[PDB]
Structure 1
Amino acid sequence: ARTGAEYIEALKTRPPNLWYKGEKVEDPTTHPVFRGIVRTMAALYDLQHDPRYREVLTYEEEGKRHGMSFLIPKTKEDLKRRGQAYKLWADQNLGMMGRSPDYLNAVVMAYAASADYFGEFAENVRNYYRYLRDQDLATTHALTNPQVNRARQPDPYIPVGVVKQTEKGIVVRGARMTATFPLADEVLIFPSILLQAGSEKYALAFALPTSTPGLHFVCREALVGGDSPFDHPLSSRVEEMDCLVIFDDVLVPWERVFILGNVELCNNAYGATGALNHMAHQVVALKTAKTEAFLGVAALMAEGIGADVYGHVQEKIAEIIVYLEAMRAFWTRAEEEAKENAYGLLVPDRGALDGARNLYPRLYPRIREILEQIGASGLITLPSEKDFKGPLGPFLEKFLQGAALEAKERVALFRLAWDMTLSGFGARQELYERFFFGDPVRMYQTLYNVYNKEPYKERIHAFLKESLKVFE
């Protein structure tokens, strides 16, 4: 429903409380560090109004059209529709934008369908879902706790906790270490870390406008690099930004509270509501798109330099193909095996999604490595468009050709491969893939604990009956 113009106007009128290198960012839509991603998100919103993609990206309901990521799926076909929307948006940025709002709309959609889970705060959840849906707003998630130097009563508000409760709502103080893509209208403070018994003061779930007084987003090093599409094909447009989120006695209205002082409710929220399943559904579609981009670049690089005649290179590209097919397989099974949860919400299969989200963090570094191995040293000496336009341009056109590519074309392609792997932007993507869904160690331990291993244990026990029978 939202247009790119509406999104841009919203951030310009009520900008997120962003700070960059010790200074407040007055207008992120024009600031050199953020204007690129803002334009990109704006383009994602505009695509919703392109007739060619209207049916893929939006659905009609009572005379209004809403983004597909808000659709509460009733059938497997509806799930497929949500998946197609995730994929189309992902493809626009070669799967490089990892925290586009549809992944969180998936979470809020599930929370709302499973609103009974929240008890007294159920209506708050349903109303918030309707607000985000109707206004088609952008969201960001603030997660991870700070640490305290115990080498130095103690301050109980380092991590975000409730200072007090009033007739208007709750006052919170503390910080969240990470919020990716802060160019949003709203920030969600939902649990991503297990809470131990006694941590009620920190067991909260709520949402706030990003301009809320007392709320501050502190940026890390900008990885944009430049505006030239030739020199910085990806960083010039898909640099989402990561930030520290500070809560200085922030007032959270009661209407925006979803969970308050309940350890168990927080710990089981994502799984019980189905938010885990739906957000992971967006993720598998996203990573399929990302892998497709790497396959395309690898294939073009190999052909462009005539390296495709080498068995070694063909094998590496085939390896990327195997991984692409693995991700497509997880995506297909996630949808085909979907079943309704305790609240009647159809959710994609967790086994398939757990497989995808626990395997891709291992596959990605290898996919990145493969591109480095194909490009080799050719990725480390790429000139700028300015050099082609300068006095030595003629020399560059004569010396920077590929076995099957003209100079400008080869450099444009290798600059993209470089931006996908070795630029500050590209390297960040690696760290991001390794950890965005959580620490792999914890994720694997979680998978071990939740998985029903009984059918297999029983089959082996049955098979061993003949072994123990020798003693009869």
Structure 2
Amino acid sequence: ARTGAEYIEALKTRPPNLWYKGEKVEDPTTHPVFRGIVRTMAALYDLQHDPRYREVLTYEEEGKRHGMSFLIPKTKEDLKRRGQAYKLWADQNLGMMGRSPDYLNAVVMAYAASADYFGEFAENVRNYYRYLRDQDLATTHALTNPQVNRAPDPYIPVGVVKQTEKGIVVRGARMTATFPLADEVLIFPSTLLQAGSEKYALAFALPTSTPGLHFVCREALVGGDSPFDHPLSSRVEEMDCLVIFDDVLVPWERVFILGNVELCNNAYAATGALNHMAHQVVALKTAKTEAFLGVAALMAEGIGADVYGHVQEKIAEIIVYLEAMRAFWTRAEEEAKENAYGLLVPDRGALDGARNLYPRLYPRIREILEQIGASGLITLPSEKDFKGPLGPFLEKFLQGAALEAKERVALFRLAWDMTLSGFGARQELYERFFFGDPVRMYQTLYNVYNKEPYKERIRAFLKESLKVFE
């Protein structure tokens, strides 16, 4: 298990090929746009060494101690242990961090347990997993193919340029990678692959510092460094990037899938990576929802709005959604079964329910906070104003029905950062699409779900109807 210092040191030593507004970022650990998330990720690693949480966040094996997200679960109890670790880590940042390492570690763990799926590349997969686990490295993954203005370069989407004796050379780009402050980047199956697209049907991993690999940043959403003024954006801004592959060399040892269309398309499901990564997500969203509930309750109480029935109802609505997610989480673990490779995977029915329902619930939970805070959310002064000449006046005029001025503004700055700041609004779009387009996700659910039992019950029930004709 790695410490925060080791993580920071590694990033400083071999920084990702990050670009911010046309310029290379030489040291993300100190750059104003990235130092916040770097310190936050480091704290997650440090927590693994806190005596209070050591047993929750790590497990001992043959003299070594590894992060819980690497644990290949053999029993439901193990599954529960993985869940508690997902939850503890998520709670540190109120469920705002969407690409913490444990999400992808769950994917690689599943890939490794189901390694046979990869055929000749099986050993590569098992060894990559051992590497990530032993070094306790942080990963990120690049998704989505770009479009081409059709109003003939074969390397727009990431593709194999040539295969040598040392590996493959890839060229192209992935539209987005969240949290590039990782040691590694996964280029796994993303956009559905059509027949004949073997040149793009590949899966591999690379150090984020690889020559020819470029991460181009979007506008920074860090509001500032003050925790009072920007309680969340000052520390949990993960960043999103365009990922460019300029004739990047991928060593054979890092190739997991090569030129196999169907293998790529079925990878996540077959290996159980889908199940485990969705397991991390449901625990993460439960944490996120608990945070919104807490803020909503404190806001209502703080301004005396809790006496209003409709406010009580909005808060109760959040409680209902929280219980829904907890329920999906419980059933996912309790109904877990082993897959074709012997890997115990949490129930897909329950996890599909959670990841397809939350994208609809989140915008409403966000709306609820907006409706409770109302106009009190857009005219919040800075800590600098409290510290300034007018400080006395602010303490006299910014009080809440049950809160002093500094307390009220601090709480409202948080509610604001959770919803209306650039950071807060991004969280909304992210929840709506992080697992994919709801339109495609729902069509996928429709096709995979076994509807036969319900259809049969109705046909049986209809026998009596058709009998009137005999």
Q: TM-score range by the shorter chain?
A: over 0.9
Q: Measure, in 1, the Cα distance between the counterparts of 2:101 and 2:186.
A: 11
- Confirm or deny that 1:2 pairs with 2:2: yes
Shift of 1:15: 0.3
| Alpha-carbon separation, structure 1, partners of 2:76 and 2:164 | 44
- Deviation per CA, 1:22-75, whole angstroms, max 9, x where unpaired? 000000000000000000000000000001000000000000000000000000
Instruction: Name the structure 1 match of 2:399.
Output: 401
Q: Which residue of 2 aligns with 1:62?
A: 62
Instruction: Tell me how far 1:192 sits from its aligned partner.
Output: 1.9
| Structure 1 position 402, deviation (Å) | 0.2
SS in 2 for 1:56: helix
Q: Which moved more, 1:448-457 or 1:189-198?
A: 189-198
Quote the offset at 1:437 in angstroms: 0.2
SS in 1 for 2:149: coil
* Structure 2 counterpart SS, 1:397: helix
Paired with 1:97 and 1:184, the residues of 2 have a C-alpha distance of: 14
Partners of 1:100 and 1:261 in 2: CA distance? 30
Equivalent in the alignment of 1:142: 142
Q: Aligned partners of 2:190 and 2:170: how far apart in 1?
A: 18
Cα deviation code 1:148-177 (max 9, x no counterpart): 0011xx000000000000000000000000
| Residues 1:118 and 2:118 aligned together | yes
For the pair 1:427 / 2:418, whether they are aligned, the reply is: no
Instruction: Map Cα deviations across residues 252-280 of structure 1 (whole Å, 9 max, x no partner).
Output: 00000000000000000000000000000
Residue aligning to 1:157: 155
Deviation, structure 1 residue 394: 0.3
Match of 2:48 in 1: 48
Distance in 2 separating the partners of 1:141 and 1:318: 37
The Cα offsets for residues 277-332 of structure 1, whole Å up to 9 and x where unpaired, read as 00000000000000000000000000000000000100000000000000000000
Q: Quote the Cα distance in structure 2 between the aligned partners of 1:58 and 1:427.
A: 34
Q: Distance in 2 between matches of 1:188 and 1:194?
A: 17
Q: Distance in 1 between matches of 2:196 and 2:433?
A: 27
Q: CA deviation at 1:126?
A: 0.1
Provide, for residues 187-240 of structure 1, a one-character-per-residue CA deviation record: whole Å limited to 9, x for no partner: 000012210100000001000000000000000000001000000000000000
> Which stretch has the larger CA shift, 184-193 or 278-287?
184-193
What does 1:242-391 align with in structure 2 at a 5 Å threshold?
A: 242-391=240-389
Q: In 1, Cα distance between the equivalents of 2:298 and 2:90?
A: 21
Distance across 1 between alignment mates of 2:168 and 2:142: 18
1:420-444 Cα distance to aligned partner (Å, 9 max, x none): 0000000000000000000000000
- Counterpart in the other structure of 1:171: 169
Aligned residue runs from structure 1 range 18-57, under 5 A: 18-57=18-57
Distance in 1 (CA, whole Å) between partners of 2:450 and 2:197 is 29
> Which whole-Å deviations, capped at 9, do the CAs of 1:8-31 have from their partners, x for residues lacking one?
000000000000000000000000
How far apart, CA to CA, are the structure 1 residues paired with 2:273 and 2:350? 15
Instruction: Give the deviation of 1:378 after TM superposition.
Output: 0.2
Distance 1:109 1:181 in 2: 20
Q: Secondary structure at the match of 2:174?
A: strand
Give, in angstroms, the shift of residue 398 of structure 1: 0.2
Give the aligned CA root-mean-square deviation in angstroms: 0.3
Matches of 2:168 and 2:360, distance apart in 1: 41
Q: Secondary structure at the match of 1:427?
A: helix
Write the distance in 2 (CA, Å) between the matches of 1:25 and 1:357: 35
Number of aligned positions between the proteins? 470
In structure 2, what is the Cα distance between the partners aligned to 1:389 and 1:271? Answer: 55
Q: Does the residue aligned with 1:463 lie in a helix, a strand or coil?
A: helix
- Displacement after TM superposition at 1:416 (Å): 0.1
- The match for 2:461 among 456, 460, 463 is 463
3-state secondary structure, aligned to 1:224: coil
Distance 2:90 2:223 in 1: 22
CA distance in 2: counterparts of 1:60 and 1:194, whole angstroms:
39
SS in 2 for 1:173: strand
Q: TM-score, normalised by structure 2?
A: 1.00
Distance, in Å, in 2 between the alignment partners of 1:2 and 1:213 is: 26
For residues 392 and 235 of structure 1, what CA distance do their matches in structure 2 show?
Answer: 26
1:451, distance to aligned residue in structure 2 (A):
0.2
Helix, strand or coil at the partner of 1:247: strand
Q: 1:53-104 deviations in whole A, cap 9, x for unaligned?
A: 0000000000000000000000000000000000000000000000001000
**Inter-partner Cα distance in structure 1 for 2:25 and 2:379:** 35
Name the structure 2 match of 1:15.
15
Distance in 2, matches of 1:111 and 1:352, equals: 21
Structure 1 residues 99-114: aligned runs within 5 Å: 99-114=99-114
Q: Distance in 2 between matches of 1:235 and 1:468?
A: 63
Aligned-pair CA distance for 1:359: 0.2
Q: Which runs of 5+ in 1 are unaligned?
A: none
The residue matched to 1:464 in structure 2 has which SS? helix
CA distance in 2: counterparts of 1:310 and 1:251, whole angstroms: 62
SS of the counterpart of 1:216?
A: strand
Question: SS where residue 66 of structure 2 aligns?
Answer: strand
1:397 Cα deviation (Å)? 0.1
- Please report how far the alpha carbon of residue 7 of structure 1 lies from its aligned counterpart in structure 2 after TM superposition: 0.1
**Secondary structure of 2:108 counterpart:** helix
Which residue is 2:231 aligned to? 233
Q: Secondary structure at the match of 2:78?
A: helix
Gap regions ≥5 residues in structure 2: none
C-alpha separation between the residues in 2 aligned to 1:448 and 1:464?
Answer: 24
1:449 CA displacement: 0.1
1:3 CA displacement: 0.1
1:365-424 Cα offsets, whole Å, 9 max, x none, are 000000000000000100000000000000000000000000000000000000000000
3-state SS of paired residue (2:322): helix
CA distance in 1, matches of 2:98, 2:318: 20
